[PDB]
């Protein structure tokens, strides 16, 4: 019953592939709903055309700034920020989808996908989903990151929406 959403990823115009995500609405319904709605654009704004602005190989890929496209922006469907819903789910391994933030209770639209177990983030970032299909695409995106996160090409959500 959990929603499934997809991103079609391109590297400066070159199609890379589709990543799909299960959103754990059963555990974090408010956080899952925000991501679902931003992925469909049904509130009038969202992730389509935004990039993965910070990519660190062996760690994670971060994106979701559709307001400024410079890594400082983003907003939720509830307002500029919303609470950390709960920390039941942990950063257990690759594929984990979690909220980026600037401190407690500052969730907006920015998110990241883990490419490794990142347990030191447990209790600080809200985990709310996981890659279902296309983990190979996320691994491919890593080659375009670097140790300090700066990307060598713009990794774009060319299209996105909801599958189930
Ligand atoms: C421009 O923004 C700045 C700087 C933020 C991060 C800088 C930075 C640079 C290099 C390496 C790393 C972080 C490594 C250690 O950590 C991550 O990659 C972590 C990994 C989990 C997701 N994530 N970034 C985050 O959630 C980070 C900390 N936060 C942000 O990106 C927020 C966004 C959501 C407004 N920005 C802010 O708090 C500021 C206004």
User: Where does residue 156 rank: exposed (0-12), middle (13-18), buried (19+ CB within 10 A)?
Assistant: buried
Point out which residues pair with 156 in neighbouring strands.
10, 51
Instruction: Identify the domain containing residue 67 by its residue range.
Output: 1-164
Q: Determine which residue's CA is closest to atom 5 belonging to ligand 1.
A: 102
Q: What DSSP character marks residue 113?
A: E
- Please tell me the experimental approach by which this structure was elucidated: X-ray
The helix or strand, by DSSP H or E, that contains position 138, with its residue range, turns out to be: helix 135-142
Q: What DSSP character marks residue 16?
A: E
Atom of ligand 1 nearest to the CA of 108: 34
For the record, the structure tokens of 58 come out as 């062996």
d(C-alpha 57, C-alpha 92), whole Å:
17
In the block, residue with structure tokens 């115009």: 13
Q: What was the resolution (in A) of this experimentally determined structure?
A: 1.5
Cα of first residue to Cα of last residue in the chain, in angstroms, is 8
The CATH number assigned to the domain holding 129 equals 2.40.100.10
d(C-alpha 74, C-alpha 16), whole Å:
24
For the record, the structure tokens of 40 come out as 């469909």
In the chain, the number of structural domains is 1
Residues contacting 66, CB < 8 A, separation 6+: 38, 45, 46, 47, 48, 49, 50, 73, 74, 109
Ramachandran angles phi, psi of 39, nearest 5°: -70, -30
Among the listed residues 52, 112, 128, 144, the single catalytic one is: 112
Residues contacting 40, CB < 8 A, separation 6+: 5, 46, 160, 161, 162
Q: Are 40 and 162 in contact (CB under 8 A)?
A: yes
Q: Are 85 and 101 in contact (CB under 8 A)?
A: no
β-pairing, 111-114 with 4-11?
Answer: unpaired
């Amino acid at each position: 019953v959990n929603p499934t959403v997809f991103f079609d990823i391109a590297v400066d115009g070159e199609p890379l592939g589709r990543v799909s995500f299960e959103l754990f609405a059963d555990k974090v319904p408010k956080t899952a709903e925000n991501f679902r709605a931003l992925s469909t654009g049904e509130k009038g704004f969202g992730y389509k055309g935004s990039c993965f602005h910070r990519i660190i190989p062996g760690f994670m890929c971060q994106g979701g700034d559709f307001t400024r496209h410079n890594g400082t922006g983003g907003k939720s469907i509830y307002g500029e920020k919303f609470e950390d819903e709960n920390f039941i789910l942990k950063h257990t391994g690759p594929g984990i989808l979690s909220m980026a933030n600037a401190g407690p209770n500052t969730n907006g639209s920015q998110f990241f996908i883990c490419t490794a177990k990142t347990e030191w983030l447990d209790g600080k970032h809200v985990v709310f989903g996981k890659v279902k299909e296309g983990m190979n695409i996320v691994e491919a995106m890593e080659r375009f990151g670097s140790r300090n996160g700066k990307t060598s090409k713009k990794i774009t959500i060319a299209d996105c929406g909801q599958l189930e």
